Design a binder for this molecule. Sequence first.
Ligand SMILES: [Mg+2]
Ligand SMILES: [Mg+2]
Lengths: 109, 51, 56, 199, 236
Amino acid sequence: SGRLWCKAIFAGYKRGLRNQREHTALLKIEGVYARDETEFYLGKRCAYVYKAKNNTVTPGGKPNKTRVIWGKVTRAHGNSGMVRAKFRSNLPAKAIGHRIRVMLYPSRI
Amino acid sequence: RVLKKNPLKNLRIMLKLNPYAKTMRRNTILRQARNHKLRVERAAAALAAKS
Amino acid sequence: EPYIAWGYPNLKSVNELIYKRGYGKINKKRIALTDNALIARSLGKYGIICMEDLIH
Amino acid sequence: QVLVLDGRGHLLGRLAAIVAKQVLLGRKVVVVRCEGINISGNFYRNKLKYLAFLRKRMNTNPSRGPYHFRAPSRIFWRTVRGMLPHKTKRGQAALDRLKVFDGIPPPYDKKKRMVVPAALKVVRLKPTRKFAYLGRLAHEVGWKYQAVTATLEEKRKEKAKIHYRKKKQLMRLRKQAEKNVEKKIDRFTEVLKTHGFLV
Amino acid sequence: PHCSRNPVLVRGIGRYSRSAMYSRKALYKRKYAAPVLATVTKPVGGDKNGGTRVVKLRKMPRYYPTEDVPRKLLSHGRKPFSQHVRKLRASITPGTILIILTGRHRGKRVVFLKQLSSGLLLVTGPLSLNRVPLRRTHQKFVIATSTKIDISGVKIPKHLTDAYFKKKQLRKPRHQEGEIFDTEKEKYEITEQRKVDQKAVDSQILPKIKAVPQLQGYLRSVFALTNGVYPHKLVF
RNA sequence: GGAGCCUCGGUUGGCCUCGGAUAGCCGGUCCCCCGCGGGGUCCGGUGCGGAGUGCCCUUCGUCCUGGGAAACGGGGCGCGGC
RNA sequence: CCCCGGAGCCCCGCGGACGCUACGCCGCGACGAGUAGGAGGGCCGCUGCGGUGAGCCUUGAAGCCUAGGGCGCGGGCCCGGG
RNA sequence: CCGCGGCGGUGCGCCGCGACCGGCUCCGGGACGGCUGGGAAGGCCCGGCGGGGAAGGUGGCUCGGCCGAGUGUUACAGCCCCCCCGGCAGCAGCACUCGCCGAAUCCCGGGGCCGAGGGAGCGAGACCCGUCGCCGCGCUCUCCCCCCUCCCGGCGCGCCGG
Ligand SMILES: [Mg+2]
Ligand SMILES: [Mg+2]
């Protein structure tokens, strides 16, 4: 009856300064700020979630405007608890600086 | 084409190349078991001497 | 000097190179030393017949 | 969901940095009482440095030119915008989240307003160094509404005193009420101090 | 048929040896001095006039197709699910408490009972308190809390097992085409057997939780994150 | 109150002293001055800050009956005045 | 101490691909910047002649158009509708 | 037609799992070698032998209530420090993490990610199939015994006989 996903931003794609690489996001996870406090999240399932004009289906439900691109937090990005994910399609850049729900549910706990 | 599986990791591959590794690595488990025990009995004898 | 780094290896270094990255040069084709019968075939004339002998 | 930082006692470009990066991650940020913000290095120094910036202008048609805002709010907002990608859409989208103020007006006068210590003068300057107050610097460079901002803010602080006083009174009541009550709350309060509060 | 005469030191490496084994098994003393045309192979039948016929068990194919795939290559390892070894996070002991994350018992707290054959967890949030019946869950979608009831001694029925926790309906043909056929049927009904089994388990567990103070309430409550709180930081 | 295109973000709140930094915070004044408060001194407390944003508040299944602790609190987008 | 028109087969010398357009098919390795310039292969393409498809075509050729469907690294090509 | 028996290839669309192998990337454990056969340290103390900062001391002055605090001087040991002779088991590159270098003197277990890329059966009365190399083992065709006890059988949850 409440939230079951730790919040995270999608900060952008993996990149060198002058060369972007779209297939590999950088998620800033809320409240985690050290390549130390980011083991937990490795292996986890994450979802850019959003909605659109035409309906879609929905697992365990009637048709609905919301869609997601699933992903997976793959590994731990540079020092300040930033992380890397890898989604099943690449994220759309409209997303840059929005929410992507990171789940708990591939747990090693 | 033959897949090179790494012997260092893959126990059996190691053996197929160098069969003696089985014995070496039988020891240095047992050798270490021996030595782990001995350290427990030392630690017991230090706790007993402290008591 | 400026192009290479070099030095005197360990034993371990030899093994870790030869098992993990050791490939024969057999009929000029690079070939992974998967089995001893590749080393022997080409160095048997020298009493070198298995991975272990090569390291030695 | 909103960051309200009291601009006071920060270092101009130090706080800007943090704000920029926040604003680009999609945090709606409000800075406030910018005229409190203080820039490292001595005053005369910085006035001169603003006066360079006023010297800059397109010869042929000044009207097109670098738009030297005089208001210390704007001045901060200009220096965030220098730490953003503001030609793009995403940089302009970010900049529309930053909200800045000359003093501190009604929506955020009654808000717990944060501080960034990494931008804080008392942390980042050595205490034997000089620093401008932006308020002064704006003032001498052409900002009008210093006195008006000040004299509204006296009226803000007086009103706040009252709020605080009344808070203090409720806190004193609570303390007294716990002392009145303690015996009938003992086997709660105990558990909150076995699991690490109250102590 | 004796068991293994050496133990395991580590996967694949025997504790003993060859020659230390030679002694144990005793390869000394256990030495074994040991120095169609007309006749049809596999058909045969009876029958009346002309005599008895010879059939042929397994008669060759009435048709071949024009092209076909050609074998594979043996592959060595790779072992059908049934035979796989199973696992379990050490944090999950019998009669631990879980947070079942993912299904319609989403965030519901619950009591773990046993590992099934499958690999899944048998679980129950004694349907009474929580509204979570005798159900399976997958290790993976399940936070293990550090709260444990001493479930130790409860005869969780033998007959309840991976097979009986398994979905059921639907066969092939019927009327099919139109606006009918198994779009109806409609409901999963619960079955008396299942209601008995739940009863039998609940009665046994339920006291144990009521012996712990608060725990029944804890269990009723749903897990859920909120503001100012982080999975990585907190603990279960 | 009923349907019905479209646009999307979100997925507990925090309702506030001023400020100081080679210092602060809170009490209570027995006592004194000013307009229940403000200022003062004095004393008593805290001060790696628990009268702590390392915080605080808020709870997250629904109902039944039939005991205790707690108990006059909550509501009717309850209604009129200051 | 015997014969494969039957040892039953991990090797079979009695006969041999699902495979074998031998300008075919298969397996190992290593390698792959390129103007000027050279060479190779194009089941890339245009027009015409000898052959050849018991080719296609008024039950619709050529050409033209195409938010239709495909192939090809590509040159280009095949389809659907008009 | 029911068998979803055996084999072969498949999934309409979206998904999830599992175990195996390849590769990485980390984590947690332990066992060892060497050295100035490590340096320091710790712990028990005893006997001596000196030297110095500076002391339960004394002294001039100051500041507080003979006592406490702050400066100052000569300086023994009744605060320590230092060297010199002689001797104990507690060490151990030490979870009292003070300072290395290492592993045939070295092994165990766990997690994250990416990947699967190949296909030694096209016989007419007898397999639609295994398997090569390596590990061992494991078992058996050799006998004994002991334990625990799952199925089943027997006797009183306990005991006895796969
Ligand atoms: Mg929604
Ligand atoms: Mg080239």
